[PDB]
Structures are given as C-alpha cells and as structure tokens.
Amino acid sequence: TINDLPGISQTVINKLIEAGYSSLETLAVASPQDLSVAAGIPLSTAQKIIKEARDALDIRFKTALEVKKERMNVKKISTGSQALDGLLAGGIETRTMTEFFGEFGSGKTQLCHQLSVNVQLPPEKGGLSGKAVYIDTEGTFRWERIENMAKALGLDIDNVMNNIYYIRAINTDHQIAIVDDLQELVSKDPSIKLIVVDSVTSHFRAEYPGRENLAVRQQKLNKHLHQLTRLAEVYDIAVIITNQVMHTLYHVPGIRIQLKKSRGNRRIARVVDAPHLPEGEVVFALTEEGIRDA
C-alpha cells in the first residue's frame, strides 16, 4: 500500500505505479542512487521512502521465547507450502475467513483440498487433528487427488476422506441452505476446524448476471458471506472461500489472497486486503504431493 505512504507526494507515485513499485517490499530494497534515476524525485527523499518501507513489510526481531508464546497463542493450519504459511503469518488462522482467488488452475481450488487434508492433523505437523467441510460449488472436488494428496503426508487415505464432510451445492438456493445447515453441523461435531467453500460467486453470477441483477446479487451474495463469517469465529472454525476470476473484490472484509500462474508449476501469492498482513507476495508450487514450494 504505497498509497498509504505516510508523508510522500502522490504526484510522484503515478510513476511508481508506472514501475514494479506497487510493492512496498520492492521499495524497502531499492537502490537510492538508482531509485531517483528511475523515479525523478531527487536521490534524496527517495531514501525517505525506503526507511518507512522497512517498517511496512514489518521487520521487528522477536525472541524465540516470545515467538513460542505466539506459536501457542494461536495454531494456524499449514498450507504445506512453507513460503505461503510464511505469507499468511503462520498459515490459515481460525475464527477468520480467508479468501483466495485467481484464474482457473491458479491454485484456489487445489488448496481447498490441500487445506482439508491438513486440518485433520497433529498440531506438530501443522494441523489440528480436526475434520473438514467441503461445499463443492462447481463440481471440482477430487478424492482422485484428496487421495494422492494425503498419500504424500503419510496418513490413511480411506481414513482421511472419511474425515472430510462433502456436499455438492448446485444453485444459490441449494448453496445458501447448505450453509444454514452448517450453522448446526458444527454444533454437532465440533471437531470440524475447517469449512471450505469453492467457489462462492459462481451460482450468483450465473443466476444473476449483468448490472440489473448486480443489485439483488449483491444483497443475496453478501448475506451469505456474513453467515459464513459468524460460524468461523463464533465456533472457532477456519472458513475459507474462493472466487474464480480471469471482479468480486467487494467490501465483505477478510484476508484476500490472489494467486497467479507463473510458469506451469509455480504460482504467485499476494496479500491484497488484510489488516494483520504485511503486503507482499511469495511464489510456491502446485506439485503432485499437493501444495508445496518450488
């Protein structure tokens, strides 16, 4: 958020957006006598935009004593890509709704799997030994993956899936109700520490396209995201949504990470909107084992 830059002249920023400088981290590591030669602004205060940037990325050295406390405070769910856990500040935290979105194959979906296989996991391996709830929206769930995905961490295939609650949501109506029955499912099994929803806007978009419906859609769409925030927090679950986009960046606030295909196997992750997250991006890979780093 260079936009949020403390005391700079945005008048010079419409040249930074004109370069790979939309990144606050790009900045923190920029060469002064070359940040001016590529920014116009004197090779002077160009030095001022960086010192603030060291703070932005948030670089404070904690202690292995304190950190182990935080580590015990909250216990996030690992993505299997350590880079990314790094990105999310530990992995997927509970009581929150973390959105991922990108183009098809970007990873948003693969990850709903990778995440539902690692929830059911000993906190030592990055899980919570808890079970998951997969609301298949478009019919893209694969055990033909969930399998060789767990078939990598070493757990019991057949035991794994069993630990994942599955359902296919075929239309808004069905999809909304289904979330209203989750309101209670969690009430039953409170071992459920994950609620994946892939991909939330599809039926709405499909059922209420254009601008004339861009109204009712919003109303309808937003109520559904709210109901979803409640159950994560109130019942300590990790709700996780997904949107597909080749554009739903709406103000229904949560961590919103974007994914981009890099080169066939590597994908890029960037924190787009999120209070507690230091803007930035990490690369990772879509491997057979599932979600990992290249």
Side-chain angles (χ1 to χ4, degrees), residues 81-96:
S81 170
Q82 270 298 300
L84 171 47
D85 293 293
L87 194 67
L88 295 177
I92 296 66
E93 192 184 354
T94 37
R95 233 177 298 300
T96 68

Side-chain angles (χ1 to χ4, degrees), residues 60-76:
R60 312 274 299 184
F61 305 72
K62 316 297 182 184
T63 187
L65 172 53
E66 203 296 285
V67 188
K68 187 181 75 184
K69 286 314 164 205
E70 290 189 60
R71 263 304 325 159
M72 301 188 270
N73 290 323
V74 186
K75 320 197 201 314
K76 310 190 176 189

Side-chain angles (χ1 to χ4, degrees), residues 83-120:
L84 171 47
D85 293 293
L87 194 67
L88 295 177
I92 296 66
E93 192 184 354
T94 37
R95 233 177 298 300
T96 68
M97 177 157 109
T98 314
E99 175 192 344
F100 287 75
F101 68 86
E103 316 195 318
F104 173 57
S106 50
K108 42 172 191 51
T109 309
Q110 272 198 38
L111 195 70
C112 283
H113 295 73
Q114 186 54 266
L115 271 174
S116 77
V117 155
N118 313 320
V119 201
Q120 63 182 78

Side-chain angles (χ1 to χ4, degrees), residues 133-259:
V133 173
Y134 205 101
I135 321 230
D136 201 321
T137 261
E138 295 188 300
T140 47
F141 171 106
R142 306 316 179 203
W143 1 271
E144 303 177 74
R145 181 199 296 269
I146 284 301
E147 286 169 0
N148 60 305
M149 189 170 260
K151 187 176 195 179
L153 303 189
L155 289 225
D156 176 46
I157 313 281
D158 327 297
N159 179 198
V160 186
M161 320 195 318
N162 149 59
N163 281 304
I164 297 159
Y165 286 68
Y166 179 93
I167 185 164
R168 167 64 176 295
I170 62 99
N171 54 36
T172 46
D173 297 351
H174 275 247
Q175 183 177 306
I176 302 190
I178 307 175
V179 181
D180 287 355
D181 297 338
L182 195 64
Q183 318 171 288
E184 58 175 295
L185 173 51
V186 308
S187 284
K188 175 180 180 176
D189 185 348
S191 178
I192 304 175
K193 303 307 184 182
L194 173 56
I195 294 176
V196 160
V197 203
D198 184 276
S199 28
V200 275
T201 302
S202 176
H203 298 343
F204 292 97
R205 226 128 50 178
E207 303 180 58
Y208 305 84
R211 322 288 170 184
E212 43 294 71
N213 310 284
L214 121 82
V216 197
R217 194 196 314 177
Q218 278 295 45
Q219 198 289 296
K220 288 195 166 311
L221 174 58
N222 283 289
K223 209 161 85 192
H224 198 237
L225 304 167
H226 297 319
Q227 308 206 64
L228 269 170
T229 307
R230 306 264 42 190
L231 312 194
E233 49 191 13
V234 179
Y235 304 70
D236 181 65
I237 290 190
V239 170
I240 285 170
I241 60 172
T242 286
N243 293 297
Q244 181 154 301
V245 316
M246 184 294 132
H247 302 307
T248 59
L249 300 188
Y250 43 43
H251 191 212
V252 195
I255 296 177
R256 306 189 69 217
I257 310 299
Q258 164 170 50
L259 321 168

Side-chain angles (χ1 to χ4, degrees), residues 13-28:
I13 298 181
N14 207 60
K15 189 172 187 287
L16 309 175
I17 197 66
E18 297 307 314
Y21 281 99
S22 65
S23 191
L24 309 176
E25 70 204 327
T26 292
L27 266 170

